[PDB]
């Protein structure tokens, strides 16, 4: 599963986490098994306009 | 006239009653949790802890 979010919000992407994105956009199960990958895109996904 | 001639049967009755009573009394203990009642724990914390 792929998407884009800000720098501060990546901490919300974890099992048993509460916040704003974790409960209204993407919710992970408490007993999640797997892995999470996050990398920077400020030089590609950020626009001057 | 004389009492305390039937110590054995009274002793048996007392032992049974005392064991049951302490078993019931053990419900109020904490065992290191934050409270002795499930409702408060459920209504004051999120699932993870």
UniProtKB/Swiss-Prot annotation, chain B:
Region entry Heptad repeat 1, spans: 1-31
Protein name: Spike protein S2'
Function comment: Subunit of the fusion protein that is processed upon entry into the host cell. Mediates fusion of the virion and cellular membranes by functioning as a class I viral fusion protein. Contains a viral fusion peptide that is unmasked after S2 cleavage. This cleavage can occur at the cell membrane by host TMPRSS2 or during endocytosis by host CSTL. In either case, this triggers an extensive and irreversible conformational change that leads to fusion of the viral envelope with the cellular cytoplasmic membrane, releasing viral genomic RNA into the host cell cytoplasm.
Coiled coil: 10-49
Stretch of the intact protein here: 940 to 988 of 1273
